[PDB]
Symmetry: D2
Subunit: 257 residues, 4 copies
């Protein structure tokens, strides 16, 4: 997965959330490789510093970091603004967030439900509406890519809150697609199955726990992170100039059922 | 809409939320006519008593009411519990709620968005899990019917929060179908277009919606009600994890 | 089960194809109990009169039969015409057809594929456009109900031609809904999983075959025939007066994936 | 929208059908630029010779042409065989066909319906099963990209046969994803809205006839040919390595509804 010709994003101004762990870090690394200028947000200052250092020396990338928790008061509006300001505008948002508190539906805990809605649905939704407003005012079109899940698309045991949150965000994405489309802004989601990030391996590593999952994936395996990143780079590029309002599963045929 | 034979809900114990206004009143009326025993919930004591009186007089229906604010803490779990105590278990949950704060996506207000999620998504979602846990434990199956919207299925301008919330509840409903299915519990959703309730007619601007409905009109309340009655009866005994647009063709696109 | 109140179909004139066996025979029984007047089609004249007899005997129903092979190019146009003559018009069309020639996709036989397409997709579509034309002309609305399968919504191994044909008809139905809706004609589909007709129980009787299909049905069983008939009677009745262009799975949750 | 890096198709062996006109010619141009080796099928010998020559002169591409009519006895399996023997195997099928006979459902003509099904559904499906057989047999994976339509996903007035045909092909494609996925074969569809090829421009150029259609596209325009080619190249690439059984609307948001 190297990015050249139409998959270059030289000079494109991209905010990427949860940029220092798992999927986010890999989309950040892809975008750096592809020539992007990056605003990277996250909860850990030193991870953000490592990230600036690494992507700078490895790709010469123009990187500005924002250490913020998107659950802090007014964080979506604050992060949107700071990000637009970093380079005089945003051309891309990668809306990346994810917690998961798995539980039988009969045992759903209200606190864990709410936490999951807060982090997976509320903050990404309001970051996107704010970013989108600034995209509309600036008049240079743009792209918004939601990192959702196959769980947005097909229900999963012990994933009541998770599934619920991701399915809502996905619909949130389509409203953006619908209203911001006429301004040349394109909003689409990527919907991965399990991704073998460090955390992914730790949680889905057991053969017999993951076996039922795998047997529902025709290609017979889980995703690796660069596969998600590929799809995001494509959606950001001019190779997706007509693509709007679409959910791309990265799931080896899982969601066909 | 007379409900006879298999569409009789004789003896079925049904919790219907938001029962005193809008579609929730109609569903309650239809279930009462069908022979159901009802637990009605809502915020206003007087309207609830009013309801209980209309339905007892008109249909000879057993009616218990729970005056509760679902936004208060553990309220969903409390309504579930109290609703089941009413007749020693629930056979049906009609998960009915709905508020709408239309605004352009560019102008989305966080408090109005938070409120839409709290009311259209959060409270129903947690009412359903608790109710389901009690259905699992009783061992007598059950039917959860979510009152969603065509807006859960297709984006609608000015409806960022509204569409998000309902799309979420529709997937919530699907996880119920997947995990509670084995225990003989069916979870399904009804997704109407604009419904010409009393407030429906006033609010619906409409020409472009109607252009998208092949049948050339919006739905009337009893049509949503028909669909819920069916989903709760033995004529839907195999129907699980399904979304029934009540929309004239709209969501075909 | 039993059809009263809004589910009466008294004096409704309904053409039901594949009416001599399985799902079609069960729908004919339901429509008969519901007080409908029936035009039944089928391949065998001897099986058709056994249907007229059993239905006349149980319910005293008006039954007219047409013996015809829908595999034939001219058949749908003949059946529409002949069905129209029985009772001077149609209120309800129930498109029930099915051959199934399962085989791995790598070994797909052209003839078998062609026969499946001819009977599962082409005959019903052309019968429907013809009955629709007449329903528009009469000016009294109508209901068209396609009996497809869960296989029209989700692909199933060994079912290349079967899935393909029923997915096509489910889209045909939708165009019917789009175009005939303005005239009061409702077009919808029912998409059952395996249904334990006498035949379905023979085909899926083997535990090693049924077990992985059942693993995917949250309700933990296949459908019985009246469960399908219930859906079709509902869709035909005033209880589904605003239902148009919908696919109803009768599948215990299978097509959620 | 040019193809380097992960979007190079150097070495890859690609059968593209309908390669002398419209979208197929643009895809073939695109794959030629990506450095693929091509097999190009079609009815006309005159035009195939010009493509072998034109693509040779501009790109240095290997082109085997196959002059064939797919309505012939066993013709699809033959093109599959001839196409694979050309370079000792196929890596990619771009299963491309399309005719359209628009007319109201009530006026649906049997022959015109049969010709739409024959060309849009039957030839392609039977080709793709033959191609898939040889891919399983060789054991080196593969990708099948179906060129369908937005009309596969949402019913369009006057497009009874067309919508139906395409929706079947989309399901065909999904059965292939499910059965051939375990062998590392990926099957997906692109589903464009109107595409402004020469004819496209001629049929939909009038801003009167096409206004209601554009109203329903959030980006406010139809697709141009290369936008379809980009989506196909992407799907053929290693940047789509986990993508299986997916429909990609190339439609500015139309099919969100």
């Amino acid at each position: 997965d190297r990015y050249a010709g139409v998959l270059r994003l030289d000079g494109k101004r991209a905010l990427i959330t949860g940029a220092t762990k798992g999927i986010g870090a890999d989309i950040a690394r892809a975008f750096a490789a592809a020539g992007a200028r990056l605003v990277l947000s996250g909860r850990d200052v030193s991870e953000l510093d490592a990230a600036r250092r690494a992507l700078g020396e490895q790709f010469g990338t123009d990187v500005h970091t924002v250490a913020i928790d998107l659950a802090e008061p007014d964080a979506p509006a604050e992060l949107a603004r700071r990000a637009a300001e970093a380079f005089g505008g945003l051309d891309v948002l990668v809306n990346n967030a994810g917690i998961s508190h798995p539980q039988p539906v009969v045992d759903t805990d209200p606190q864990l439900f709410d936490a999951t809605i807060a982090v997976n649905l509320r903050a990404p939704a309001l970051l996107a509406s704010a970013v989108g407003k600034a995209m509309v005012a600036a008049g240079e079109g743009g792209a918004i890519i939601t990192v959702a899940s196959a769980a947005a698309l097909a229900p999963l045991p012990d994933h009541y809150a998770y599934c619920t949150s991701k399915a809502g965000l996905v619909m949130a994405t389509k409203v953006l697609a619908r209203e911001l489309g006429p301004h040349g802004i394109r909003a689409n989601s990527v919907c991965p199955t399990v991704v073998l990030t460090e955390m992914g391996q730790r949680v889905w590593g057991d053969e017999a726990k993951s076996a039922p999952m795998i047997a529902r994936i025709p290609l017979g395996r889980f995703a690796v992170p660069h596969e998600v990143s590929d799809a995001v780079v494509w959606l950001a590029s001019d190779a997706a100039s007509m693509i709007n309002g679409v959910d791309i599963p990265v799931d080896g045929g899982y969601t066909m059922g």
